[PDB]
Design a protein around this ligand. Structure first.
Ligand SMILES: CC(C)S[C@@H]1O[C@H](CO)[C@H](O)[C@H](O)[C@H]1O
Ligand SMILES: CC(C)S[C@@H]1O[C@H](CO)[C@H](O)[C@H](O)[C@H]1O
Ligand SMILES: [Mg+2]
Ligand SMILES: [Mg+2]
Ligand SMILES: [Mg+2]
Ligand code: NA
Ligand code: NA
Ligand code: NA
Ligand code: NA
Lengths: 1015, 211, 174
């Protein structure tokens, strides 16, 4: 029967004997326990140690397994993904389906997980009432047997499947048999860009309900015009025999205070010609001056739903957290509590590097804490309903949530093949409807989403209307089919740019500024995905936030994405490394495209996070002479846990600091007048820095948390004093194969064949391991690479434009190399050409000036042929013999920063360990750069000028040749790259050139100057 | 939906057709118990979708109907949108839930009167002349059922047509109905007689209401 | 298996193996025939004398009926309503359901109509292409078998249910 039907290859069967979806139940038998959200005796977890066997197909499952435990089955933890225990490989593929596209058929070789549990059942559970089992997550389909008898079947990996075991259980010992199939027809709607795993990966539990039960309840809050009055409307539905003595009481609680309560018997209002719902009742509770829920202040109430008899006997109670908030779109603006939102959002996949797609409370809290600490206020459940606990935490901590139905059909051709097919409407509807039924009571969910990347089909329009019909309280959004279809209340493009139109046929990505005002368009625009954070990225992130702040109808977006989807593997030593697509023998795969996070899989920040924190700041600043204008971008809260620290420093040296408490109304302004700042005698640039500090701890932050900062150049005093006339005069030792400069124990060797400073000596110590050479390339970033592979070359990607032009194999050819003795110095003039196939790419003209003070003044002038692709950098590199523990610099920092991602960095004196000057991107590239630097100190060495630099044990060559970070080896000495100029890193997407014109090195002629000396 | 030949004949002889999905859940309490239950959306959709896929090329079909007397449910709204999306060339009508819901492009009441209001709770049958001009109402009004032709009937039929002709947005209606649903039985003599509900031992029955 | 699933009591299952709906097809192999809406050799009517037996419930149906004509059965005209031949009573009810309102369940005593037809399929039909059967109207639900092998299941009384028989048929009698 079960083998004969093949319900897993039929989109017309998605469930068998599955119970109805509903909001979170616990069937409390005590009101007070319900009011306080404390554990329920009626909700037992079945998590823990389970029996598990693996099979290559369901046909290879022995008939005995239904009644008897298999001895070869290992004992494993549930919830888990079976790929994480090693039974088969996890597959990372982005767009292309991990199976053959032949709907509704899946492979005959269909990996099968045979889970089983022997467990105890109390007699008091079976004597009366109903006992259901709840599988919160089974990927991708399963059949269920209890004590050898078949219970049912379920699909949709990301929503709880529930079955009634009342007629199935016996008192004492019972055995469950869960046969989980890796591939079902459900897999066709589950093509999210993520690791393809499977198994019982979410909580399993048993719930006992009285026969006369609360089967459903919906909570609604509507308000008057100024939100001073509310009406809470709670609709309650029941199952069981209807009796006149039956009552429902809904009471609302703020802390321990009962704020309102109402009681009615069953029997709703007349609905139509046939009457009303006898099995339902609606309770209306008036609430005056409600404390409003927002992400800024997550004010929460508790509703308790009591099913009871009129003589006061409680049958059962259910409950939930209630946020008083109104979400509406009006006049093209998304409003929360009548105020226009600015979404500081992020997409978040459910991903753990150890446990795979199993989620735990601690990880969830860690993410939330990190998101909030970095000025995020919203999150998209890309691309499926989450673990139920997630919404509870967003309710309590304060995050705006987009709840997404588990529907992605990216691999179809065209993308809407299934979603326009009316035969796939039922399966699609179950994924939308059961989401809404489960999650509709959570205040944090503010927008419903119909799925992800499934084109635009008629099924989307039908389901769009369904949600609008069933829950008017939330906007519906869907990006598919061009981001502005009839299936979306919000223009929600992915990777649409700020200024640049991408006029793709049928589905153009218009500049978000242009999109808003297309003839007839009126909707708000919130990017469902933007600023692709893949490796060294978030270049041009500031450009988005400038636009968000300037355009009312530009109401932000969701960064893609939160956390790198790397997995832990182990080498021969037993040491752990971060693994990506293809590291498990999975093929076809999409390699590192699974790693687009702002944080590493362990939740270690990427340099980009600090950029997001700065741009998503809630306080803006203006300096006008002595006055600081602080503007709050908070909509609801006063700055009641905020003080402004300010600091004036001259080239790193502090001169004056101070504090002023911040007292800014939401959307208001505070003027702060700086005390007459002391004049400095010495030369240099004064820098004002302000920081907003939260003095007090919160639920999401420790005391002293810095929430915002900003910097300005104050007065600059240019150095006019001539450095004292030095006594020593350096000597030029002209040789056949060398020019040598000597000053005391110091020596500079200029090789007359190459044209470079081949060696420097301090006494008997050599300083260089590799000569000082021009560099015009970088270890290509993910943004430089794109979807370019050796198997299929994309000639448009930066790395390929560069490769094709010869940038990486361009050989230096000396043109001029002369020396001169000046009055008090030696001057080395050189000229080089970098050529490839007869084409001069770059000409580097240099002067080296070494004077009595022992300072090497390098002046560099570069020509770049206009018809060569613009180079990654115009700089110098060399390998230093020295290895020091500290790096010290006057410039932007502390963290890694690039020209199009440096707004979060501050100019100051920075001191970091050498390790910190390297960013461990799982896929190695250029990294660790710091810009606008005037002084760099490393061991004996000091460099001065106006340049950018990175400094590490890793050469560009090793970085670009090494696929994974764990395969990297410290080279001898220290590799230094000092750039006069450095190309942006881009990131608007990671599959086409995304570096803006203003951050491309297009000038043709470039000048920079360094001073090198020992200190 | 009708026997396929029916549409071919209506194309050829010239009759305007309302094509109705095979959904009626009249006996439910309340009427929309199934049509508002999303678990029944699949079964409902196939009845709407497969109709459209069969009949969409027939010129005589000028209006799609979402079914009959099934109250108004969210399922109706979803399938209303589905049709508008798949076939823009034809209006969508549905009477359930008070004849003027969001699931109908046409105000299509059954047995609403010319001048007299029948102000039922939740689902009133306004006088058709009044219905048109209710605050914010713009739609056309065509009675999906009117003038119940049961036995000696059609009293006041002229009153409808005076209204239809005088009011632009009163665009007529569909008389209920074409043909008596009587069946042939035979007595002791072998003589044929017209039979109704209850004559076949069927019970509970609604007697002559089939005529 | 069919007995064990009870698909007529599950609104989740409304069809099994049913082909996609579509506008009226005739599959003319000649354009002029199609232009003039003349009959098509590729569209055969299976109307006429079928064999029919009545059962109080699907449980009461013998397993033997799948491969052999039941001797108890009569020979009846199709299309028809079995009420019109006198096998059971038609029921006239306006609003109130003819059966107890207990969705999705139906009465255990469920008048089952067992229709069968012996017909011949031509050689040329099975060597190339696809041979589908079209039931324009079956009330209220049905399971189909061809030559003993199960084909599929269908609901909705008022729309055609189509099933592919290419794999199921043999030349000559079926
Ligand atoms: C390569 C693009 C055409 S598809 C692109 O892949 C990205 C890689 O992380 C993300 O998954 C995006 O959502 C998707 O649009
Ligand atoms: C008796 C009414 C409450 S229902 C009334 O019954 C009629 C009898 O012919 C028709 O079937 C109508 O369509 C129906 O609305
Ligand atoms: Mg299936
Ligand atoms: Mg995708
Ligand atoms: Mg069924
Ligand atoms: Na804005
Ligand atoms: Na990705
Ligand atoms: Na008129
Ligand atoms: Na009638």
């Amino acid at each position: 029967v079960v083998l004969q039907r093949r319900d897993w290859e039929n989109p017309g069967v998605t469930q068998l004997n599955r119970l109805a979806a509903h909001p979170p139940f616990a069937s409390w038998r005590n009101s007070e326990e319900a009011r306080t959200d404390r554990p329920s005796q009626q909700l037992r977890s079945l998590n823990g140690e389970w029996r598990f066997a693996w099979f290559p197909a369901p046909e290879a499952v022995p008939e005995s397994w239904l009644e008897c435990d298999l001895p070869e089955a290992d004992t494993v933890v549930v919830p888990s993904n079976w790929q994480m225990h090693g039974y088969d490989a996890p597959i990372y593929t982005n767009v292309t389906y991990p199976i053959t596209v032949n709907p509704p058929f899946v492979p005959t070789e269909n990996p099968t997980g045979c889970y089983s549990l022997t467990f105890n059942v109390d007699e008091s559970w079976l004597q009366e009432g109903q006992t259901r089992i709840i599988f919160d997550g089974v990927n991708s389909a399963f059949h269920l047997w209890c004590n050898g008898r078949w219970v049912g079947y379920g699909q949709d990996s990301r929503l709880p499947s529930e079955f009634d075991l009342s007629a199935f259980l016996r008192a004492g010992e019972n055995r469950l048999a869960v046969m989980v199939l890796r591939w079902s027809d459900g897999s066709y709607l589950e093509d999210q860009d993520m690791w393809r795993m499977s198994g019982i990966f979410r909580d399993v539990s048993l719930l006992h309900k009285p026969t006369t039960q609360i089967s459903d309840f919906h909570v609604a809050t509507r308000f008057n015009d100024d939100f001073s009055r509310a009406v809470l409307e709670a609709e309650v539905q029941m199952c069981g025999e209807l009796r006149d003595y039956l009552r429902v009481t809904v009471s609302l609680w703020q802390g321990e205070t009962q704020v309102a309560s109402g009681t009615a018997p069953f029997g709703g209002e007349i609905i139509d010609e046939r009457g009303g719902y006898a099995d339902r009742v609606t309770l209306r509770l008036n609430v005056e001056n409600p404390k409003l829920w927002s992400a800024e202040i997550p004010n929460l109430y508790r509703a308790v739903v009591e099913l009871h008899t009129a003589d006061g006997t409680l049958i059962e109670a259910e409950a939930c957290d209630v946020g008083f908030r109104e979400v509406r779109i009006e006049n093209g603006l998304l409003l929360l509590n009548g105020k226009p939102l600015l979404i500081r959002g992020v997409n978040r996949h459910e991903h753990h590097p150890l446990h795979g797609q199993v989620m735990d409370e601690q990880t969830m809290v860690q993410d939330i804490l990190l998101m909030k600490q970095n000025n995020f206020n919203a999150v998209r459940c890309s691309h499926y309903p989450n673990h139920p606990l997630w919404y509870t935490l967003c309710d309590r901590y304060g995050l705006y949530v987009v709840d997404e139905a588990n529907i992605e059909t990216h691999g179809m051709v065209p993308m809407n093949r299934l979603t326009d097919d009316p035969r796939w409407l039922p399966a699609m509807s179950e994924r939308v409807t059961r989401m809404v039924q489960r999650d509709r009571n959570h205040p944090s969910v503010i927008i419903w989403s119909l799925g992800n990347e499934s084109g635009h089909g008629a099924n989307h329009d039908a389901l769009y209307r369904w949600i609008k019909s069933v829950d008017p309280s939330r906007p519906v959004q869907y990006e598919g089919g061009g981001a502005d279809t009839t299936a979306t209340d919000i223009i929600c493009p992915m990777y649409a740019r700020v200024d640049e139109d991408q006029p793709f046929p049928a589905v153009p990505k218009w500049s978000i500024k242009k999109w808003l005002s297309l003839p007839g368009e009126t909707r708000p625009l919130i990017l469902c995905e933007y600023a692709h954070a893949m490796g060294n990225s978030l270049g041009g992130f500031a450009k988005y936030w400038q636009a968000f702040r300037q355009y009312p109808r530009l109401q932000g977006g969701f960064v893609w994405d939160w956390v790198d989807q790397s997995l832990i593997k182990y080498d021969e030593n037993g040491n752990p490394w971060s693994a990506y697509g293809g590291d498990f023998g999975d093929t076809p795969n999409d390699r590192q495209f699974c790693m687009n996070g702002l944080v590493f899989a362990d939740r270690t920040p990427h340099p980009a996070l600090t950029e997001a924190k700065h741009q998503q700041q809630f306080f803006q600043f203006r300096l006008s002479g002595q006055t600081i204008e602080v503007t709050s971008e908070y909509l609801f809260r006063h700055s009641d846990n905020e003080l402004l620290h300010w600091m004036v420093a001259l080239d790193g040296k502090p001169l004056a600091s101070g504090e002023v408490p911040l007292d800014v109304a939401p959307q208001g302004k505070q003027l702060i007048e700086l005390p007459e700042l002391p004049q400095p005698e010495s030369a240099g640039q004064l820098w004002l820095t302000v920081r907003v500090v939260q003095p007090n701890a919160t639920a999401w932050s420790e005391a002293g948390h810095i929430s915002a900062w900003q910097q300005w150049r104050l007065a600059e005093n240019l150095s006019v004093t001539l450095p004292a006339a030095s006594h020593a005069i350096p000597h030029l030792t002209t040789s056949e194969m060398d020019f040598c400069i000597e000053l005391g124990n110091k020596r500079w060797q200029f090789n007359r064949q190459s044209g470079f400073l081949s060696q420097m000596w301090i006494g008997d110590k050599k300083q260089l391991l590799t000569p000082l050479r021009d560099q015009f390339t970088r270890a290509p970033l993910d943004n430089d690479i794109g979807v370019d592979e050796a198997t299929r070359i994309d000639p448009n990607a930066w790395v390929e434009r560069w490769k094709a032009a010869g940038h990486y194999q361009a050989e230096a050819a000396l043109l001029q190399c002369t020396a001169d003795t000046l009055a008090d110095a030696v001057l080395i003039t050189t000229a080089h050409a970098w050529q490839h196939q007869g084409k001069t790419l770059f000409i580097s003209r240099k002067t080296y000036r070494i004077d009595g003070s022992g300072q090497m003044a390098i002046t560099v002038d570069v020509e770049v042929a206009s018809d060569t692709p613009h180079p990654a950098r115009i700089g110098l590199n060399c390998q230093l013999a020295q290895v020091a523990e500290r790096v010290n610099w006057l410039g932007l920092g502390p963290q890694e920063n690039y020209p199009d991602r440096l707004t979060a960095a501050c100019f100051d004196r920075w001191d970091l360990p050498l390790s910190d000057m390297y960013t461990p991107y799982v896929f190695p590239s250029e990294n660790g750069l710091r810009c606008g630097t005037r002084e760099l100190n490393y061991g004996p060495h000091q460099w001065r000028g106006d340049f950018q630099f990175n400094i590490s044990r890793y050469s560009q060559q090793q970085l670009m040749e090494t696929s994974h970070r764990h395969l990297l080896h410290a080279e001898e000495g220290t590799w230094l790259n000092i750039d006069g100029f450095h190309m942006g890193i881009g990131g608007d997407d990671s599959w086409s050139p995304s570096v803006s014109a203003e951050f491309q090195l297009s000038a043709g002629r470039y000048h920079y100057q360094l001073v090198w000396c020992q200190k």
